[PDB]
Design a protein around this ligand. Structure first.
Ligand SMILES: CCCCCCCCCCCCCCCCCC(=O)OC[C@H](CO[C@@H]1O[C@H](CO[C@H]2O[C@H](CO)[C@H](O)[C@H](O)[C@H]2O)[C@H](O)[C@H](O)[C@H]1O)OC(=O)CCCCCCCCCCCCCCCCC
Ligand code: CLA
Ligand code: CLA
Ligand code: CLA
Ligand code: CLA
Ligand code: CLA
Ligand code: CLA
Ligand SMILES: CC1=C(/C=C/C(C)=C/C=C/C(C)=C/C=C/C=C(C)/C=C/C=C(C)/C=C/C2=C(C)CCCC2(C)C)C(C)(C)CCC1
Ligand SMILES: CC1=C(/C=C/C(C)=C/C=C/C(C)=C/C=C/C=C(C)/C=C/C=C(C)/C=C/C2=C(C)CCCC2(C)C)C(C)(C)CCC1
Ligand SMILES: CC1=C(/C=C/C(C)=C/C=C/C(C)=C/C=C/C=C(C)/C=C/C=C(C)/C=C/C2=C(C)CCCC2(C)C)C(C)(C)CCC1
Ligand SMILES: CCCCCCCS[C@@H]1O[C@H](CO)[C@@H](O)[C@H](O)[C@H]1O
Ligand SMILES: CCCCCCCS[C@@H]1O[C@H](CO)[C@@H](O)[C@H](O)[C@H]1O
Ligand code: OEX
Ligand SMILES: [Cl-]
Ligand SMILES: [Cl-]
Ligand SMILES: [Fe+2]
Lengths: 451, 334, 35, 81, 137, 342
């Protein structure tokens, strides 16, 4: 039971996994077994979603999060997001589930049967956290793997059938990307966009050419950087700036995953390009705009002149200006005038919403989509009663957007907490005071009084 | 040494009456900016068109408020989540009408308070302390972020951020109830358990330590004089306190370990308040409290109301009245 | 060494444990009631 | 350290389980039956799903008389049958 | 109070003929109304056009009259405006627009009758709450 | 010992798993009945006759929605004793009349008395000062003000809080719409003592855990403590310096610190109790008269205070007909306050 109690390891059972810090074999076991849990859930969850799936109801009325991910890659779907073939969903689910048994096998072997440390056994697989060279080398391998993953996405989009494109002219459809955006001024220009309203930083990406081109960049950057880290050792200023310890490295990764978690939350909440509304339901801004569109359509059918209709406040009941002059929907949705979506853009001219297009060119498919999106707004109760909070029971609905945003905000937040926990512990343990203050060397007793 | 080196030495000095530090280099100016703007707006700002419907709400003392009604009012619904710094406005007069001070204050305050949290880590490291006081402060800080940034982002507008004012705060609470049924949300319920239990354990701990202070003073002196700053000996009898509390309930319900006791004292409120913060931050994306409206139905299909339905009626009153000139269409979707 | 069975504690435990199990059986049955 | 047999002694002993593998299930089943027989409704005066309202009755049988509320409930209850 | 054969007895046609629906049909009508209709008509209102509700008195004054199984079944095949003047299949789910309203694709004749039966039965149970909106919650 | 009194005293005070005491004779049966009455009513008992509500697992409610509800308004402030003039010994009718409400409220009140007598009795036997009992006066002031004084000032027990999760939520919202209770400075002082107490609970636990002396080799530090040790487990001197430099002030006296931790939440609860005694009489902080005079004459004057009264007016009109069934309110649609569209 090598290190498997508090007396030996110095760590209580509830911090038991800290017993692994310097046991590279068992720690590799933990890691591989864990990757099996992730792959397991992906496969089992997909099969479950498929078993429950009624192809003619929208995905977003069915509590699906994984099928929508698969569909967006262009598997299983046709024009408008119509499901034409569930078999690809099946394949994805099965292949992950089978794969997780392999990973789970490796994990159990390393964790329980293999060498508890790897260093005696192998110098390629063994490691010391304080070995800066081995650390950047392993980091470099993983960078290359990630780079190849990003390029797989490019391969799908360009050579293996394309991606679902909500923006396809004539209507949403799978489309092969042939002219991916390579211009670094566009690709890196996204990184310098404001995260505030009407800008949206990277969340603003609104076409698949930029999406594909960015992963071309990212795949190349990751592979290059991975090579770089295999071939180099950290610079002096790097060595002086960081703590070099397993717990410190966990902490840097915790911060990064926290940040990424927050980013994903805003991505699923606002973006309707890589989270097509055909699959994920309308965004909050989209459904609110769809409501105004719905009543503009209705009342104008009844004979209202929607351009000149002054609402109770003096602002136009249907149509008003944004603070920079663009014609936008009125009522509370004035806040959502940065919204853009395929069903609405045909009505937009260089000055914003165009009154002549509004009066003459609204098609029945736009009315239908706007009514669908208004009535699938991402609002609903924790027990999945769809609607505002005062709604009566009947409609079993919570948008996949709310489930995905809320879950990722919770995760990203607790990951920030773990970052602070571990970054501050790593600092203290590196300096030697993580177990408490030395009673005979209490630093504050050697300092001058404040007053 | 060189100027830079001495500067760094000063910034990081353990000897300054108030610790500065690198977090402090950001915290000091941002907190000063938010404080000064807040005080001046709270006294003297003109009315702010919070809901973007040209219906300005008076927040400041000079424009007819008292301490309880006064607020710095959130920025205009017309702005939404757009960044509205002073230099984006044509004039200070426009900036004021549209609730510019609110954005200035809350952005500087959030940055400054996040740096306050970093600074707590920083000093603990300078003093050779363990590092997690800053993790306890993450709970109130998360809660401030939820109401001033996450909620507005979810709903698409800083006009739905919590106002900087006492009555404004209650306005935010009541509207939040109509829109999310927060009382019926388990994360807010855990927050209540966190703050009521924090109060409870605060009183409990205060009273148990106070009850077992070792006699060191006479009946004329405050017993507080029986403790001297920096003494080595513990000032109360924990075995006596445990002896009492273990009998009040039962032996194994009481801590005799002060470290476990103080960990519990930290953890209970901090965890509950993290769930409070995550309640607001996930209702930000409209995953709302439990809805049992019309859940109980008799043999014919008559609705048999429960206390949940009575809640619903109070929620409806809030919903139909709030921002009474701002809705033109039948659903309040953000 | 040699313990009493029935104590104030024993009584305390059963004043609570006994109705608890009875109630739990009642509430389980309830889950199959239809209107 | 107050004398009584330690709980963890008791609940890992064969004998505890001989007694309780019968008493626990018996209590649970009795609770079940208190509901499944309908008896719970009559002891507590709780309406069955078919007894909240008469077939065409408009309003709730609210008690409005302090000292004859008991009689009110009794009259309210025949007005179902 | 009970869900009796009488409560389940509704107008079959414009001429005063009735049909008594079974309890299975009642269950099925609620289920299918939730499936295909409640996103807009929860509680007997219409979210995207609140002027028109599913109350029986409103249905009776529609053209053709919709306060009977036949009129409701026909509405679900070929919906019209309230005056009977335009066909609105292109913007309202129907059998004839099952291509653009895919949830209509597997509704059978039997299912349409069940949903029509739910629309006529529910107000006999809920009275003014049916088609009442939030005032009656 | 001596006589029977002293032999009884002996047995009452035996050192056992659950201490009994003389207080135990009052505490145990009252607490047991209050708790069992709650579980009994929430599991099995309706509120159809008193409120027109289902309220038990038996009727289909869940843990959030069950309650033991108050008696009908026509019961007034009846003690509603099983053997009294209302139930006349009929247990079934007593349940349907809300008799479990006054059963729980009154046994609960005696039980709390017994609990606080317990804290005094055990303190005296162990030889500690009775500050825990003293702190417990705050729970007593809250329970007595809210569950007894408040409904006693109103028309009946009907308006006391009902014992249930959703029922208490309803009580909060009623107090907002009818009493504007958030505006009340005694409630505000309550809120300060609760949140300030939770603040002191967190900050004192974190500070001790982060100024610990290294008293063992373990990286899990809980074992490095002994209840009997003479020495402070953490450094008051270092904790003082840390907060002095972070916040500007710090505790330096541990005795003061711990008395302040009693003081803050205890005082806050006592302040909230006083505001509730005023609400028993509808003696509210509902309005600022200067605000109303200005707003009546100036239709462009708006504050968050005027906005909140509009919310209150909605709450009263929308909730009253179902929440106050004995009033037989019928509010035609046309009279209900509503803003535009909603
Ligand atoms: C280490 C670095 C730390 C340095 C800190 C200080 C630097 C400042 C960082 C910014 C912080 C907040 C900025 C405001 C965030 C926001 O409004 O974010 C929203 C934006 C997205 O913005 C939206 O982006 C949209 C993009 O959609 C557009 O494009 C789409 C394309 O399909 C669609 O067409 C869509 O309809 C169309 O509108 C629009 O532009 C919207 O108007 C716009 O609001 O998200 C984004 O940029 C994603 C990035 C934001 C992540 C959110 C972080 C939350 C922080 C939590 C902290 C908790 C702390 C706890 C402490 C304890
Ligand atoms: C990649 C992520 C990651 C990894 C590898 C680690 C790894 C480690 N952490 Mg960190 N940590 C993380 C993220 C991570 N943590 C996050 C996000 C937080 C914020 C909460 C923390 C906070 C944290 C603390 C406070 C501590 C550690 C400690 C440790 C060490 C021991 C962990 C252990 O044995 O737990 C054993 C596991 C348990 C006791 C189970 C925890 C149960 C959780 C809290 C409930 C989860 C609920 C679930 C999702 C839903 C319910 C399920 C169902 C049953 C109802 C180990 C090095 C300890 C230490 O510092 O060692 C150096 C320590 O004291 N971690
Ligand atoms: C993702 C979850 C996870 C993973 C992957 C690990 C991994 C590990 N832990 Mg941690 N741990 C966890 C969660 C986890 N732990 C939690 C939640 C807690 C708090 C309860 C702990 C508390 C803890 C302590 C206190 C200790 C560990 C230790 C260990 C290691 C040695 C285990 C051992 O001795 O097994 C012995 C157990 C068995 C022989 C029972 C069977 C175990 C196997 C793996 C079951 C596999 C089942 C699976 C269904 C089989 C599929 C087979 C198929 C593919 C063919 C191992 C690498 C130990 C350590 O660090 O050693 C140095 C150690 O002392 N853990
Ligand atoms: C990213 C994570 C994620 C997201 C966004 C979803 C989303 C969804 N799931 Mg999936 N799922 C997940 C992970 C997720 N799930 C996991 C891990 C499992 C294995 C248990 C499943 C297994 C599963 C099944 C079997 C089903 C779903 C279903 C659903 C849908 C309804 C969910 C619901 O009703 O919740 C109810 C809400 C809860 C149960 C509350 C969860 C709150 C947790 C306990 C709090 C977490 C706090 C934090 C992590 C703990 C920290 C402690 C602190 C001290 C540090 C929804 C689309 C349903 C569906 O419709 O399928 C089609 C369905 O049947 N899921
Ligand atoms: C990142 C995961 C990982 C890492 C770093 C290691 C590393 C190690 N393994 Mg473990 N193992 C793993 C996962 C891993 N293994 C999995 C998933 C399983 C189940 C299949 C096992 C089952 C296993 C056994 C049964 C044994 C080892 C042994 C070893 C050692 C020798 C390996 C070697 O020399 O191969 C040299 C190289 C090759 C044989 C060629 C590798 C071919 C791979 C499979 C090609 C695929 C490449 C591609 C990038 C895979 C992507 C996977 C991803 C999508 C999930 C070394 C310590 C041995 C050891 O412990 O000795 C005492 C040993 O006996 N492994
Ligand atoms: C997981 C990915 C990863 C990780 C963990 C590391 C880790 C490391 N890198 Mg490597 N690198 C990577 C990927 C990665 N790298 C890739 C893909 C490339 C190719 C582009 C490189 C190319 C590279 C070079 C050329 C160098 C490193 C160096 C280093 C070391 C210190 C870096 C540092 O101080 O950053 C902290 C960042 C700074 C100090 C920059 C200033 C801080 C600014 C103000 C932050 C602004 C960002 C802000 C939060 C906004 C976010 C979004 C924004 C882009 C708009 C460390 C070992 C250094 C080294 O030692 O090589 C041996 C070094 O010179 N890397
Ligand atoms: C110490 C324990 C204790 C206390 C303080 C209470 C207190 C109370 N109980 Mg509870 N009760 C208890 C234990 C207790 N109970 C137990 C063990 C049971 C199970 C049997 C109950 C079951 C119970 C029920 C079923 C009810 C109560 C009720 C009450 C209330 C009215 C009691 C009353 O008027 O008595 C009056 C009697 C006395 C005060 C005794 C006085 C003793 C004097 C000094 C001597 C009397 C001698 C006399 C002259 C001789 C006979 C009289 C002769 C003229 C005919 C009050 C809150 C009622 C309630 O809650 O209604 C809402 C109610 O219905 N209790
Ligand atoms: C280390 C450790 C641990 C952990 C462990 C783990 C984490 C593991 C994992 C594991 C895993 C991760 C596993 C997996 C497995 C899997 C499998 C075994 C699979 C199988 C599959 C199948 C069999 C399939 C089938 C099918 C098909 C093919 C089709 C459809 C249908 C079905 C689905 C039926 C714990 C915590 C305990 C603690 C101690 C230590
Ligand atoms: C894919 C894609 C794309 C692209 C992308 C990209 C190209 C990205 C990039 C990215 C990047 C490129 C990022 C970066 C980041 C960075 C960071 C995140 C940093 C951090 C830092 C740190 C953390 C530091 C720290 C420190 C300090 C500050 C001081 C001293 C000390 C220390 C060192 C601690 C797009 C959008 C177009 C479209 C969609 C898709
Ligand atoms: C009223 C009355 C009385 C009394 C009665 C009694 C005394 C009763 C008791 C009763 C009881 C004594 C009952 C109990 C019950 C219990 C239950 C019903 C339980 C349940 C539980 C559960 C369900 C659990 C849950 C949980 C938690 C809490 C946490 C953890 C997790 C879980 C979820 C598991 C007399 C005859 C004198 C007279 C007249 C009236
Ligand atoms: C690791 C996954 C290996 C399986 C890769 C499957 C190729 S994917 C395949 O490619 C076709 C074009 O060749 C597309 O038309 C089609 O949509 C797509 O399904
Ligand atoms: C319910 C207890 C309150 C009554 C206390 C009055 C005690 S009374 C007292 O009791 C002694 C035994 O203890 C006898 O020896 C003595 O003769 C008698 O006067
Ligand atoms: O702004 Mn402030 O409050 Ca959130 O919902 Mn929509 O918007 Mn307005 O109504 Mn309800
Ligand atoms: Cl309002
Ligand atoms: Cl609107
Ligand atoms: Fe303390």
């Amino acid at each position: 039971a090598t290190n498997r109690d508090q007396e030996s390891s110095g760590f209580a059972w509830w911090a038991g996994n800290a017993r692994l810090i310097n046991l590279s074999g068992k720690l590799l076991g933990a890691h591989v077994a864990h990757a099996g849990l992730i792959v397991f859930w992906a496969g089992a969850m997909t099969l479950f979603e498929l078993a429950h799936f009624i192809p003619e109801k929208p995905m977003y009325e069915q509590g699906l999060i994984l099928i929508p991910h698969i569909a967006t890659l262009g598997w299983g779907v046709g024009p408008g997001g119509e499901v034409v073939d569930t078999f690809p969903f099946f394949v994805v689910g099965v292949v992950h589930l089978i794969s997780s048994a392999v990973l789970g096998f490796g994990g159990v072997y390393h964790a329980i049967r293999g060498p508890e440390t790897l260093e005696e056994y192998s110098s390629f697989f063994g490691y010391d956290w304080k070995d800066k060279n081995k650390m950047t080398t392993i980091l470099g391998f993983h960078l290359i793997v990630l780079g190849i993953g990003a390029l797989l996405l490019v391969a799908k989009a360009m050579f293996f059938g394309g991606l679902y494109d909500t923006w396809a002219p004539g209507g949403g459809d799978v489309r092969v990307i042939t002219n991916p955006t390579l211009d670094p001024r566009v690709i890196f220009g996204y990184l310098l966009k404001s995260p505030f309203g009407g800008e949206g930083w990277i969340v603003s990406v609104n076409n698949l050419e930029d999406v594909v081109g960015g992963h071309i960049w990212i795949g190349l950057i990751c592979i290059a950087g991975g090579i770089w880290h295999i071939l180099t050792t950290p610079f002096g200023w790097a060595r002086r700036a960081f703590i070099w310890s397993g717990e410190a490295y966990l902490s840097y990764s915790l911060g990064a995953l926290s940040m990424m978690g927050f980013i994903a939350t805003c991505f699923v909440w606002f973006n309707n390009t890589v989270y097509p509304s055909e699959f994920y339901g309308p965004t909050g801004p989209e459904a609110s705009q769809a409501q105004a569109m719905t009543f503009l359509i209705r009342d104008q059918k009844l004979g209202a002149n929607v351009g000149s209709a002054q609402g109770p406040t003096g602002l136009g009941k249907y149509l008003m200006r944004s603070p920079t002059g663009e014609i936008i929907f009125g009522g509370e949705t004035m806040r959502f005038w940065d919204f853009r979506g395929p069903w609405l853009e045909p009505l937009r001219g260089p000055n914003g919403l165009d009154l002549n297009k509004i009066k003459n060119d609204i098609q029945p498919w736009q009315e239908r989509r706007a009514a669908e999106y208004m009535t699938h707004a991402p609002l609903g109760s924790l027990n999945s009663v769809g609607g505002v909070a005062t709604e009566i029971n009947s409609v079993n609905f919570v948008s996949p957007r709310s489930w995905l945003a809320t879950s990722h905000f919770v995760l990203a937040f607790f990951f920030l907490v773990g970052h602070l926990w571990h970054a501050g512990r790593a600092r203290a343990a590196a300096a030697g005071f993580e177990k408490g203050i030395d009673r005979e060397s209490e630093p504050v007793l050697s300092m001058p009084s404040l007053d | 040494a060189n100027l830079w080196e001495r500067f760094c030495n000063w910034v990081t000095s353990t000897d300054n009456r108030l610790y500065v530090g690198w977090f402090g280099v950001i915290m000091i100016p941002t907190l000063l900016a938010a404080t000064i703007c807040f005080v001046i707006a709270f006294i003297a700002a003109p009315p702010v068109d919070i809901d973007g419907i040209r219906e300005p709400v008076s927040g400041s003392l000079l424009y007819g408020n008292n301490i309880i009604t006064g607020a710095v009012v959130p920025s205009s619904n017309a702005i939404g989540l757009h960044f509205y710094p002073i230099w984006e406005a044509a004039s200070l007069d426009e900036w004021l009408y549209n609730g510019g001070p609110y954005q200035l204050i809350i952005f500087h305050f959030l940055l400054g308070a996040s740096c306050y949290m970093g600074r707590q880590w920083e000093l603990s490291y300078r003093l050779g302390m363990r590092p997690w006081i800053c993790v306890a402060y993450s709970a109130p800080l998360a809660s401030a972020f939820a109401v001033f940034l996450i909620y507005p982002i979810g709903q698409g507008s800083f006009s739905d951020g919590m106002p900087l004012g006492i009555s404004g705060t209650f306005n935010f609470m009541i509207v939040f109830q109509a829109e999310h049924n927060i009382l019926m949300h388990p994360f807010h319920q855990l927050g209540v358990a966190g703050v009521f239990g924090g109060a409870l354990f605060c009183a409990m701990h205060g009273s148990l330590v106070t009850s077992s202070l070792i006699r060191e003073t006479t009946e004329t002196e405050s017993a507080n004089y029986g403790y001297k700053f920096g003494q080595e000996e513990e000032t109360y009898n924990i075995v006596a306190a445990h002896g009492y509390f273990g009998r009040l309930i039962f032996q194994y319900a009481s801590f005799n370990n002060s470290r476990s006791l103080h960990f519990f004292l930290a953890a209970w409120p901090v965890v509950g308040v993290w769930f409070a913060a995550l309640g607001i931050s996930t209702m930000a994306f409209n995953l709302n409290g439990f809805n049992f409206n019309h859940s109980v139905i008799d043999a014919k299909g008559n609705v048999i109301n429960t206390w949940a339905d009575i809640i619903n009626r109070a929620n409806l009153g809030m919903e139909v009245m709030h921002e009474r000139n701002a809705h033109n269409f039948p659903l309040d979707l953000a | 060494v040699s313990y009493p069975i029935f104590t104030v504690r024993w009584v305390a435990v059963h004043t609570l444990a006994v109705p608890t199990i009875f109630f739990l059986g009642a509430i389980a049955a309830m889950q199959f009631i239809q209107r | 350290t107050t004398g009584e047999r330690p709980f963890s002694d008791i609940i890992t002993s064969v004998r505890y389980w001989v007694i309780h593998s019968i008493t626990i299930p018996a209590l649970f089943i009795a609770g079940w039956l208190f509901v499944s027989t309908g008896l719970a409704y009559d002891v507590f005066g709780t309406p069955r799903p078919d007894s909240y309202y008469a077939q065409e009755q408009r309003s709730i049988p609210l008690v409005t008389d302090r000292f004859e509320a008991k009689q009110q409930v009794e009259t309210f209850l025949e007005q179902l049958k | 109070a009970e869900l009796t054969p009488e409560v389940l007895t509704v107008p079959l046609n414009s001429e005063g003929k009735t049909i008594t629906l079974t309890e299975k049909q009642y269950l099925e009508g609620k289920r299918l109304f939730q499936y295909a209709c409640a996103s807009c008509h929860v509680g007997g209102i219409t979210k995207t056009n609140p002027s028109l509700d599913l109350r029986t008195e409103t249905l009776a004054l529609a053209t053709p009259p919709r306060d009977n199984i036949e009129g409701l079944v026909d509405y679900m095949k070929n919906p019209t405006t309230y005056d009977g003047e335009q066909e609105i299949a292109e913007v309202h789910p129907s059998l004839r627009s099952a291509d653009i309203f895919p949830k209509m694709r597997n509704l059978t004749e039997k299912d349409l009758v069940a949903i029509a039966g739910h629309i006529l039965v529910e107000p006999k149970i809920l009275g003014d709450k049916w088609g009442g909106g939030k005032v009656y919650y | 010992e001596r006589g029977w009194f002293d032999i009884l005293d002996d047995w009452l005070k035996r050192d056992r798993f659950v201490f009994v005491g003389w207080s135990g004779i009052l505490l145990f049966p009252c607490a047991y009945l209050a708790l069992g009455g709650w579980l009994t009513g929430t599991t099995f008992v309706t509120s159809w006759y008193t409120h027109g509500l289902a309220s038990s697992y038996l009727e289909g409610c869940n843990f959030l929605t069950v309650a033991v509800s108050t008696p009908a308004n026509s019961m007034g402030h009846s003690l509603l004793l099983l053997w009294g003039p209302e139930a006349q010994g009929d247990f079934t009718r007593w349940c349907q009349l809300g008799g479990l409400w006054t059963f729980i409220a009154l046994h609960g009140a005696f039980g709390l008395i017994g609990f606080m007598l317990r804290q005094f009795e055990i303190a005296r036997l162990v030889g500690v000062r009775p500050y825990n009992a003293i702190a417990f006066s705050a729970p007593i002031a809250v329970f007595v003000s809210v569950f007894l004084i408040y409904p006693l000032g109103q028309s009946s027990w009907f308006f006391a809080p009902s014992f249930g999760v959703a029922a208490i939520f309803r009580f909060l919202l009623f107090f907002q719409g009818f009493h504007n209770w958030t505006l009340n400075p005694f409630h505000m002082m309550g809120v300060a003592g609760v949140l300030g107490g939770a603040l002191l609970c967190a900050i004192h636990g974190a500070t001790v855990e982060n100024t610990l002396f290294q008293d063992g080799e373990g990286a899990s530090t809980f074992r490095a403590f002994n209840p009997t040790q003479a020495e402070e487990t953490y450094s008051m001197v270092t904790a003082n310096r840390f907060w002095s430099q972070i916040f500007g002030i710090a505790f330096s006296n541990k005795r003061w610190l711990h008395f302040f931790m009693l003081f803050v939440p205890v005082t806050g609860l006592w302040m909230s109790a006083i505001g509730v005694v005023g609400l028993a009489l509808n003696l509210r902080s509902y309005d600022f008269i200067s605000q109303e005079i200005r707003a009546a004459e100036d239709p462009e004057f708006e504050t968050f205070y005027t906005k909140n009264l509009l919310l209150n007016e909605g709450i009263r009109a929308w909730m009253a007909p179902q929440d106050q069934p004995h009033e037989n309110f019928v509010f035609p649609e046309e009279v209900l306050p509503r803003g535009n569209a909603l």
